[PDB]
Amino acid sequence: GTVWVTDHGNNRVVKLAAGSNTQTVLPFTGLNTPSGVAVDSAGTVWVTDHGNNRVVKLAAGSNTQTVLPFTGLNTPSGVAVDSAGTVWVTDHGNNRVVKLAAGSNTQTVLPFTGLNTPSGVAVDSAGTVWVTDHGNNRVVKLAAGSNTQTVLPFTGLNTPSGVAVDSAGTVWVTDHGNNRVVKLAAGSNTQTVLPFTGLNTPSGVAVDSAGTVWVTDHGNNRVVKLAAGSNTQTVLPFTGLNTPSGVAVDS
Ligand SMILES: [Mg+2]
Numbered sequence: 001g002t003v004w005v006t007d008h009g010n011n012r013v014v015k016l017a018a019g020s021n022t023q024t025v026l027p028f029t030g031l032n033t034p035s036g037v038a039v040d041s042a043g044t045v046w047v048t049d050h051g052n053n054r055v056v057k058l059a060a061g062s063n064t065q066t067v068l069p070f071t072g073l074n075t076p077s078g079v080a081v082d083s084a085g086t087v088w089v090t091d092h093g094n095n096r097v098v099k100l101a102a103g104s105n106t107q108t109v110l111p112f113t114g115l116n117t118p119s120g121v122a123v124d125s126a127g128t129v130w131v132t133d134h135g136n137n138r139v140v141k142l143a144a145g146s147n148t149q150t151v152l153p154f155t156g157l158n159t160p161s162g163v164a165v166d167s168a169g170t171v172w173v174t175d176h177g178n179n180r181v182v183k184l185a186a187g188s189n190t191q192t193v194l195p196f197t198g199l200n201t202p203s204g205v206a207v208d209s210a211g212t213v214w215v216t217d218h219g220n221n222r223v224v225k226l227a228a229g230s231n232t233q234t235v236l237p238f239t240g241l242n243t244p245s246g247v248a249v250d251s
Contacts, residue, residue, distance in 0.1 A: 009242025036078035204246035
């Protein structure tokens, strides 16, 4: 239930530990316009350091930032990590999605086709990869071991900015251009719209195993949350956010 946020406008990553209402600032260094964040159950944090065309990670309680050995990134927009430690990145400026398997020294390009300005990525424990294909107003997926993408049956998306998936295969998307969050359950082809209100250019979404949903409400400099079944959003007690770009939660 810990929440991490890329506080883009302030070139920093903040967190609110489970049970705390006072954020901490993580000791990343030299970030610029950081665009997204991913975490694992060990509390390692990965960040797309967008303005520096790189991906960095920080282990829990450390003072060591590691630059991951990706190649040729341009304006990278989002990151996802699985329990095996593979890292996926939406390489926005190159219209592609790349990954580093844990322990690999060079990235792989995923066999998506026709992407434009991809904005975000999520993975599940089966290794399925979902991408917000922002420039085409759609969400695409590759199943583990497949090289044939499919397009999810969302409707009416505009400049979608981020995606999250749970262990049941439900998919949530920040439909940025429409100021809303939409979801599709696994066996569903009819989206619902979550009861957030007053969102402005929402930038990212995270879910936990209990079905709580957190959203970086970028245009209002805040993070909002709906617990599973809730109909009233809660503004988290972060302070000083500016143009926040992404959010990740752990269990
Ligand atoms: Mg973004």
